[PDB]
Design a binder for this molecule. Structure first.
Ligand code: GDP
Ligand code: MG
Length: 175
């Protein structure tokens, strides 16, 4: 059923869906769940791993944010026709919740992405101390975003629950 979501978007115009987040958020797991094609890894620069899933019209692009230095945001290339922006958060890793707010804000300050629709996957809801989507919203202050269409979706990637729902939203926003 996930592939059929992106049928609505088969309009022929190439389309990037940038999916980022701190390492170990759940990005690789979500791609593999998209069941849309192979995951292909590339290293355009020392310390810059990129995972890609290209369906027909759609292109997925994933890499990690923070920790090590951003000295090279060569990412600029991929900011071409990124209509969607997915940010994956480990709803359990409360230690790095500050960093995710930093990282998200940066992506949000990226000029070429000003028009991207933003989806947040609150991932790992299945763990002991995993944040709910109401507090994750508060602690990030997505609330303050006035002119940016955005949404938060609880998920468990390892189980694939929520992913269809959140992509159903995003898919629909870009159609
Ligand atoms: N409990 C739980 N674990 C997950 C979930 N999604 C991914 N993981 C695990 O958390 C780790 C995150 O790995 P990965 O998906 O590669 O994150 P990435 O580095 O952003 O690509 C992996 O060991 C996954 O098996 C989830 O929804 N719930
Ligand atoms: Mg990864």
């Amino acid at each position: 059923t996930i592939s059929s979501l992106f049928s609505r978007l088969f309009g022929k115009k190439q389309m990037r869906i940038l999916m980022v987040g701190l390492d170990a958020a759940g990005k690789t797991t979500i791609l593999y769940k998209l069941k849309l094609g192979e995951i292909v890894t590339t290293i355009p620069t020392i310390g810059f791993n990129v995972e890609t899933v290209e369906y027909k019209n759609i292109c997925f692009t994933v890499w990690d944010v923070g920790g090590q230095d951003r000295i090279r945001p060569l990412w600029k290339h991929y900011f071409q026709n990124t209509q969607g922006l997915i940010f994956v958060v480990d709803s359990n890793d409360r230690e790095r919740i500050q960093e995710v707010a930093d990282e998200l804000q940066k992506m949000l300050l990226v000029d070429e992405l000003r028009d991207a629709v933003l989806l947040l996957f609150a991932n790992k809801q299945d763990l002991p101390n995993a944040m709910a989507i109401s507090e994750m919203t508060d602690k990030l202050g997505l609330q303050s975003l006035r002119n940016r269409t955005w949404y938060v979706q609880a998920t468990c990637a390892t189980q694939g629950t929520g992913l269809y729902e959140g992509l159903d939203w995003l898919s629909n926003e870009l159609s």
